[PDB]
Structures are given as structure tokens and as C-alpha cells.
């Protein structure tokens, strides 16, 4: 089996995006933990682990088609200072990923490669779920305010 170079190009681009997202999410979780926002940090850490799982699946698919995974290239990592900025950066990443996923799914399904299309379909569903969560949190912050919102995620906790 030897896949088309275009399919492998799409998969490698998605892999680079996954690695960038992993780095950004872990850094954000550590930064949030340093400030005393424990409950946010737990959620962000879980999201980073999910990003790893996506990256592993993509790597396995690329290896099965007799390609060379790219572990050297990275995109630009966004770091925010307040919580609104972190949420906005995550939203940007998710939107880019969703657009790429849709275009790649169409292209792959046009050339009789169904398994890669199914992989991108699952990843797309997960990305949509995460973006919905991010938008809900941004709305909550907009309504309550930053201080009253942050008052609900701090624990003395030994």
C-alpha cells in the first residue's frame, strides 16, 4: 500500500497542528495552576491528554501508508495573560483545525481512501465539542464578570 502524496501532506499538516495544540494546552494548564485556579487547570490538562491521543492516532495512520511522520515542524504558540485571552487563543486554534479537517475530508473521500476520511471525521467531532465548551465559558465570563467568575474555581485544598 502506498497512499497519494496529497493525502500524506494533509495528514502531516494535521499532525503538526496537533503537536502545536498539545504544547499550548500544557503551558496554559501550568500557568493557570501557578495562579491558584485549580479546577480550570484540571480541565486544561485533560484536554492536552486528548490532543496527545489524536496525535498518536494520526501517527499510526501515517505509518501504515508507508510515509514519514514529521516531528520537527511547529506552528506559532499563543500565550495569554488573563483567562479571556487563553479562551480566545484556544478558539482560534479550534477554528483553524476545523476548516482544515473539512477540506481534507472532502479531498480524501474524492480519491477512494475511506479510512483516513473516517479518522478526520472523528477528530472533527471532537474539535466541535471543544469549541462549543470554549464559547460557553466565554459567555459565562461575559455575563458574570472576571472576579465573580474566578471566585468559583479557587480552592485552599491543603
Site residues, ligand HEM (CB under 6 A): 19, 22-23, 26, 45, 49, 52, 55-56
Residue 139 partner contact from a copy of itself, ligand HEM, Fe ion, none using kind-dependent CB cut-offs of 5 to 8 Å: a copy of itself
Distance CA 62, CA 67 (A): 6
- Contacting residue, 28, 54, 61, 100, with Fe ion by CB under 5 A: 54
Residues between 12 and 31 with contacts to Fe ion, criterion CB under 5 A: 18
Measure CA 102 to chain center.
Answer: 15
Distance CA 94, CA 41 (A): 19
Give the position of cell 514529521. Answer: 70
CB nearer to ligand HEM: pick between 51 and 107: 51
Residues in the chain: 158
Is residue 86 a known part of a binding site?
Answer: no
- Contacting residue, 86, 127, 134, 137, with Fe ion by CB under 5 A: 127
Amino acid at each position: 500500500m502506498q497512499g497519494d502524496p496529497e493525502v500524506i501532506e494533509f495528514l502531516n499538516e494535521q499532525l503538526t497542528a496537533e503537536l502545536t495544540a498539545i504544547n499550548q494546552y500544557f503551558l496554559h494548564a501550568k500557568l493557570q495552576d501557578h495562579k491558584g485556579w485549580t479546577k480550570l487547570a484540571k480541565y486544561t490538562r485533560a484536554e492536552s491528554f486528548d490532543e496527545m491521543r489524536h496525535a498518536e492516532v494520526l501517527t499510526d495512520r501515517i505509518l501504515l501508508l508507508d510515509g514519514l511522520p514529521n516531528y520537527q515542524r511547529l506552528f506559532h504558540v499563543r500565550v495569554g495573560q488573563s483567562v479571556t485571552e487563553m479562551f480566545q487563543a484556544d478558539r482560534e486554534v479550534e477554528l483553524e483545525a476545523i476548516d482544515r479537517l473539512r477540506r481534507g475530508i472532502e479531498v480524501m473521500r474524492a480519491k477512494h481512501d475511506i479510512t483516513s476520511a473516517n479518522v478526520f471525521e472523528a477528530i472533527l467531532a471532537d474539535e466541535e465539542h471543544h469549541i462549543d465548551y470554549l464559547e460557553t465559558q466565554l459567555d459565562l465570563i461575559e455575563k458574570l464578570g472576571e472576579s465573580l467568575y474566578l471566585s468559583t474555581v479557587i480552592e485552599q485544598t491543603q
